[PDB]
């Protein structure tokens, strides 16, 4: 007996197109999404060129419309030069992404004053997400308060960070957060097996105490999101390993295993992969869209999942219980038992749907 | 310029049919809903007969399918006799309602042990809501913890109650709550004008400090819901006034006024009248459904709104800014500038839609 779930949403993926298409492209990354039970993705802007201006967004929209197999929204990225320039295209984006720790020079902000300028100029009704680790979480929360608006914290990975967010929520501050599967299911204990190249990720893998703290503080976690960050094995094991793990194809199987073990409920999962993503990012429903899963099937994660061009996975060898059997997207069978059945281009930009515009005062 | 909102959801209405149709019926109460920008309602079970068994639910489903103009779900009610008997129909209901303070004999529970029995027998994946005032909030929260599940607290009306819920959420307990418009926009200061009959409501009107505390603790409020509780003026001013206010037609205009004054944002409103109702009650989206409002039009609430058979309102004389101009429900114009344009029977039971079933483990 299969369980029917709504179409799940991953608010944090890197699809690499334009500019890094040997790692992933819209077609392969959205195939990976569908195979993971995900029918809508929000794509981060740290491509090449990065999505930091209107021409780059226009290019990315057309590449996604031509290549995506599931529905999507595209983030814009904050730079040291673009505050106050994104007003005409802001509402067409998923939101604005601030890279506040390590990143590429084009997305680097050199001063908290630049963070303030983005919070002051980006339209107040539209989402802002931050890559903000350790004390940077507190710092960006301060900027949000000074500018009297909300912020969403990407991939919370540490006891320190979840407890700080917990204290902020206790004070009624408008902050939400997401956690990635590797910060719930991997830890420092896995670095010996992974090795130092494969194991590179930002935020880095936490201690056993970090992992336990995230589980203990599930109530503080608004969303799960993969931070699907594909790189090839050659890149991960070469002389300058880039940080990141692929994760679209493994996220739901890992979390269904946890549900089966009573670590969280099916509802807890659907709040974090469906309802809260919808409400934080003002993402529209998808008509005639659902995912059928088998919660009984036990399997072991192999050395690579079928679709991501990363062609490796840090979860290799983990035993899971839970499988995606079928996905229907807007009335068409999109995935069945390992076969993707919608072509590149089937997916659409949800911000162009009337119901996908973010409501605002005139 | 009009602002487009999604279809709003009111999780707490009394539509009086069967058995009290001079106060309201499905046709009139859902007309009132549409005129208030509400496209989906959850109807409480304290009708005559009350919805406490499968035959009564079957009758109510047919009356609603024949009379409702907007979409709906129907609550079941807990009684001293029905714990352990609702398993076959539970998933067809909005949820289970516990009347833990004053109510009619058929819904009265005489012991906390009966509350425990309902929490133990009602399916663990389905919603439970409670009418629970003052210390009863703490008591039902204890029962929820003993049975290791969630609870939703109806119409929170007091500083005491919102602070207790705030402390429970700080401890990570699974509790949500709603607040009704009269507990945000009326207080003891209005009892002289209303008089003792019209002013009767449960929970009673609070002090100015109660009202201020609810506003100050907006972050703790998950939903707004009207507690539309219609009675005729003759009944409200007679020898044994029943408690309750009509509120479907005034809720959104009152809250839009507050948005216009900067007391909460448009997003804060849409979280509480759309996204959080959806996610707490597992209510499905409504395709091709939206509400257009005018935020500029100033008007004064009259002595009765056009549709509710209550034919009176406690908000008479309040100045508001914000008007519902048009409602589209599933592709048909349902309301325009005071005219309802869908007939009784247009509305449907959302729990019969495939996407309206609550997901559960096999
Ligand atoms: O794009 C990536 O690979 C990437 N990888 C990471 O591990 N963290 C990031 O913040 C990131 F942007
Ligand atoms: O049904 C009603 O009129 C009603 N009225 C109220 O004021 N409170 C209730 O709890 C209620 F059930
Ligand atoms: Na397309
Ligand atoms: Na009908
Ligand atoms: Zn990041
Ligand atoms: Zn990322
Ligand atoms: Zn009540
Ligand atoms: Zn009520």
From Swiss-Prot, chains A, B:
Quote the annotated effect of residue 155 to A: Abolishes dihydroorotase activity
> Could you tell me what induces this protein?
Transcriptionally repressed following hypoxia by HIF1A.
Summarizing the annotation, the consequence of altering residue 131 to A is: Abolishes dihydroorotase activity
Specify which residues bind Zn(2+) 2 according to the UniProt entry for this protein: 12, 154, 178
Q: What is the effect of changing residue 12 to N?
A: Abolishes dihydroorotase activity
- Residue list for modification N6-carboxylysine: 97
After translation, the protein is modified as follows: Activated by MAP kinase (Erk1/2) phosphorylation just prior to the S phase of the cell cycle, when the demand for pyrimidine nucleotides is greatest, and down-regulated as the cells emerge from S phase by protein kinase A (PKA) phosphorylation.
Subcellular location as annotated = Cytoplasm; Nucleus
Q: What is the effect of changing residue 131 to N?
A: No catalytic activity
The ranges of region (DHOase (dihydroorotase)) come to 1-329
Q: Any stretches that span the bilayer, and where are they?
A: none
Write out the residues that bind (S)-dihydroorotate: 16, 46, 202, 231, 243
Q: Which residues bind Zn(2+) 3?
A: 97, 131, 155
Catalytic residues as annotated in Swiss-Prot or TrEMBL: 227
Please give the superkingdom of this protein's source: Eukaryota
The effect annotated for residue 14 to A is:
No zinc-binding and no catalytic activity
Q: Which residues does the record give as Zn(2+) 1 binding sites?
A: 12, 14, 97, 227
Coiled-coil ranges from the UniProt annotation: none
Assembly with partners or alone: Homohexamer. Interacts with CIPC.
**What family is it from?**
In the N-terminal section; belongs to the CarA family.
Other noteworthy facts: GATase (glutamine amidotransferase) and CPSase (carbamoyl phosphate synthase) form together the glutamine-dependent CPSase (GD-CPSase) (EC 6.3.5.5).
User: Briefly, what is this protein's role?
Assistant: Multifunctional protein that encodes the first 3 enzymatic activities of the de novo pyrimidine pathway: carbamoylphosphate synthetase (CPSase; EC 6.3.5.5), aspartate transcarbamylase (ATCase; EC 2.1.3.2) and dihydroorotase (DHOase; EC 3.5.2.3). The CPSase-function is accomplished in 2 steps, by a glutamine-dependent amidotransferase activity (GATase) that binds and cleaves glutamine to produce ammonia, followed by an ammonium-dependent carbamoyl phosphate synthetase, which reacts with the ammonia, hydrogencarbonate and ATP to form carbamoyl phosphate.
Which disorder does the record name?
Developmental and epileptic encephalopathy 50: A form of epileptic encephalopathy, a heterogeneous group of severe early-onset epilepsies characterized by refractory seizures, neurodevelopmental impairment, and poor prognosis. Development is normal prior to seizure onset, after which cognitive and motor delays become apparent. DEE50 is an autosomal recessive, progressive disease with onset in infancy and favorable response to treatment with oral uridine.
Name by which UniProt lists this protein: Multifunctional protein CAD
Name the source organism: Homo sapiens (Human)
Q: What is the lineage of its organism?
A: Eukaryota, Metazoa, Chordata, Craniata, Vertebrata
């Amino acid at each position: 007996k299969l369980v029917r779930l709504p179409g799940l949403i991953d608010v944090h993926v890197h699809l690499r197109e334009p500019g890094g298409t040997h790692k992933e492209d819209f077609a392969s990354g959205t195939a990976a999404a569908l195979a993971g039970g995900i029918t809508m993705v929000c794509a981060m802007p740290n491509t090449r060129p990065p999505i930091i201006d209107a021409p780059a967004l226009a290019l990315a929209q057309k590449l996604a419309e031509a290549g995506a197999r599931c529905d999507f929204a595209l983030f814009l990225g904050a730079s040291s030069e673009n505050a106050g320039t994104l007003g005409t295209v802001a509402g067409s984006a998923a939101g604005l992404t601030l890279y506040l720790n390590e990143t590429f020079s084009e997305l680097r902000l050199d001063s908290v004053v630049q963070w303030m300028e983005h919070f002051e100029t980006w339209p107040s009704h539209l989402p802002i997400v931050a890559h903000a680790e350790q004390q940077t979480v507190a710092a960006v929360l301060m900027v949000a308060q000074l500018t009297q608006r909300s912020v969403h914290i990407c991939h919370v990975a540490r006891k320190e960070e979840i407890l700080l967010i917990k204290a902020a929520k206790a004070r009624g501050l408008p902050v939400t957060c997401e956690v990635a599967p590797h910060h719930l299911f991997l830890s420092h204990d896995d670095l010996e097996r992974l090795g130092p190249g494969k194991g590179e990720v930002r935020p880095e893998l936490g201690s056993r105490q970090d992992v336990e703290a995230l589980w203990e503080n599930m109530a503080v976690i608004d969303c799960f999101a993969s931070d699907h960050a594909p790189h090839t094995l050659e890149e991960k094991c070469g002389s300058r390993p880039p940080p990141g793990f692929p994760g679209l194809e493994t996220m739901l199987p890992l979390l269904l295993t946890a549900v089966s073990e009573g670590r969280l409920s099916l509802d807890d999962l659907l709040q974090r992969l469906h309802h809260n993503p919808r409400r934080i990012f003002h993402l529209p429903p998808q008509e005639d869209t659902y995912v059928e899963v088998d919660l009984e099937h036990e399997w072991t994660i192999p050395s690579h999942m079928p679709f991501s061009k990363a062609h490796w996975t840090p979860f290799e060898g983990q035993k899971v219980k839970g499988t995606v059997r079928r996905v229907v997207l807007r009335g068409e069978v999109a995935y069945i038992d390992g076969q993707v059945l919608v072509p590149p281009g089937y997916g659409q930009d949800v911000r162009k749907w009337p119901q996908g515009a973010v409501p605002q005062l005139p």
